[PDB]
Design a protein around this ligand. Structure first.
Ligand code: NA
Ligand code: NA
Ligand SMILES: [Zn+2]
Ligand SMILES: [Zn+2]
Ligand SMILES: [Zn+2]
Ligand SMILES: [Zn+2]
Lengths: 213, 213, 213, 213
């Protein structure tokens, strides 16, 4: 499945769509390609479109960054163990917001630190307003490791490697989690990619490799 | 935005698509409709298609059930506070897998309880295989409250109310979380729906109302 | 260390204390017995007293039930990897509150379900008052598997086995977590017990064995 | 209760113990002083001893740092709503390990980054060994905000303020959590302190005040 979807993505990047946007009618719950995709929530990604999936074929799991966190694992456990998927595709992407802030800055700005509140407005170009109270949850915002770049900055090699390292960490989480079988007769397989939002083209991340530093 | 998307969904249910499935070219990170959607990962939902969103217009957050958990809140905090969205749409759906199991059954089957392992195979129609070890994470699978129905069962009033109660709980979480402003000049608004996978049509959930029992 | 502490606990159960309750003066951060204990927060447990530990000798991690959850693992990772402990002792106990409710009842009563609110008052003997709103966090209360017994009920074999199964699940979590070494030169060892609050005596839980059903 | 415990702590710091270290015999589950204490797991704290609590009087919740995270809130919800406590005491402490590392360094060293692995050995004085795989959980180690000081360093004003800010964040979490009542007839009250491990004496943290930056 994954190589056919990469060919659909080549077409997509070149200006030819493959996803059919109408309602498919009645379908069974099990994704028919036995695939789960974990991608960023970024509005510039339409995961079915950029892979040429059709409605009904894959679970589509999306969160800020496409990070493999506890919820992503919850989703993948359900997807495989209950709903029979056995392939996972990770789609991080270029110009991701998770490159542009740190957990501590956003936490301090929500808590009410006046400096952090102002700095978040300067980083985002919007009128960020502190909540003025602390919260235990979310315990982590899961910004990519490293110091921030400008929000929505053009590509750079440094940026690409930060995104790739986060993909590799997610591959390692999946390939080492006690409740996801990634070897043996019940095994799931996984591959990870970066979607370039401006070209439309996926590039694959190497694995094993560095996982964020 | 939300009422125009409901009209696109009326068209979609009736067999007329609105989403354009090609790559839109270069776009800014801020979703242009200032909307975030939280939906289930179920393969039968293509969120952009069923709402007639275009690529670039909304954050698309998807997890098993479309539940508002810690990760969903992480996503919504980033979406609003960093990326300027101010409207949220919840899309649960009919025939959801989260109606068809309990946390304890899946946990016990992954841990290695032989009875639970067999019962999960009987509930799913697949060869579920225990991992044979415990895990602290995920701490909760977030199955909808109540005893299970058959996987992918036809609609029923009881089912609909179980799904609706989970939507109302998610609306209440958003409307009471310390770090999401839902009143005042920085406020976010929210509405919740159930997508019927067989008709293609959304129906709105009342709020306030019961939140699961 | 653990067998000497069991002898101190034999003395404790028989009416002879071993812990010295005065301030020990200046001490280094590394626990001098290289032990971490995870126990319930129940007021009837004084962990240093019931094991005859002295101040300075062990990390003392305590939560509702003594459950091995994400925070317990966070604590144990720090305890071993940063602070050089290499032995873990689990102390669950009899008459634990985690035998006396379910996650769903407490969640529904906090959300505002009128039935659940009344039932929690009847189970607890106090005037439980709903918060009247939902929360994403805590995602799980981690009540022991199975239907509730009366709060603070006398011992029973069924109760003991429910507590033991939760201990075994915690041993399995520790012995299978990616970030706790429990084999090789950096290994940690672990044993699990039930403290009888009325006799003062520990009893050891078998492992491997059933982990909750 | 809290002021009487501070007088017991004055005695404790001066060399006079108050906690009785023998088994108290049969007791009810509800803590008799209606108090919950959240403290660090640091071996140099014996919470009952340093407050002069007796066995049976208070819930004792302990984790790395005494941080108010999701598990601490789970514990406090159970403590109050089920078990009738209505006062909370926070006890952070001097020379805490949570001042001496960052989340990212420990995460990268567990994942296998060779630089981080070596740097953690240099910070801890022990042979830290990487696990060589990533994990989604624990999602956060909850080190105190700011750059690390040496492990187990002597007191400093900067250190004290870092610890105090973490106490204030925990007070704010408790005083703003949807499921802890801290006003009205079911209200809980809370105060926060720093325990000096070398003198034995508590000092109280001001609130409201800065919550970490
Ligand atoms: Na789509
Ligand atoms: Na003690
Ligand atoms: Zn992104
Ligand atoms: Zn679903
Ligand atoms: Zn207990
Ligand atoms: Zn500490």
């Amino acid at each position: 499945n994954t190589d056919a979807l990469l060919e659909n993505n080549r077409l997509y990047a070149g200006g030819q769509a493959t996803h059919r946007p109408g309602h498919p009618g009645m379908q069974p719950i099990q994704p028919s390609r036995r695939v789960a995709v974990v991608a960023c929530m970024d509005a510039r990604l339409d995961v079915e479109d950029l892979l040429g999936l059709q409605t009904g074929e894959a679970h589509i799991i999306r969160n800020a960054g496409g990070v493999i966190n506890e919820d992503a694992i919850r989703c993948l456990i359900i997807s495989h163990h209950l709903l029979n998927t056995h392939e996972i595709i990770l789609v991080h992407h270029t110009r991701c917001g998770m490159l542009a802030f740190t957990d501590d800055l956003l936490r301090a700005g929500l808590e009410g630190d006046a400096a952090a509140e102002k700095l978040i407005g300067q980083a985002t170009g919007r009128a960020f307003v502190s909540a003025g109270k602390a919260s235990a949850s979310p315990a982590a915002f899961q910004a990519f490791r490293g110091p921030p770049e400008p929000l929505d900055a053009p590509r750079s090699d440094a940026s690409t490697e930060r995104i790739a390292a986060d993909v590799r960490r997610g591959l390692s989480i999946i390939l080492n989690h006690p409740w996801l079988p990634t070897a043996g007769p019940d095994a799931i397989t996984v591959r990870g990619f970066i979607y370039d939002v401006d070209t439309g083209r996926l590039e694959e991340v190497s694995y094993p490799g560095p996982m964020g530093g």
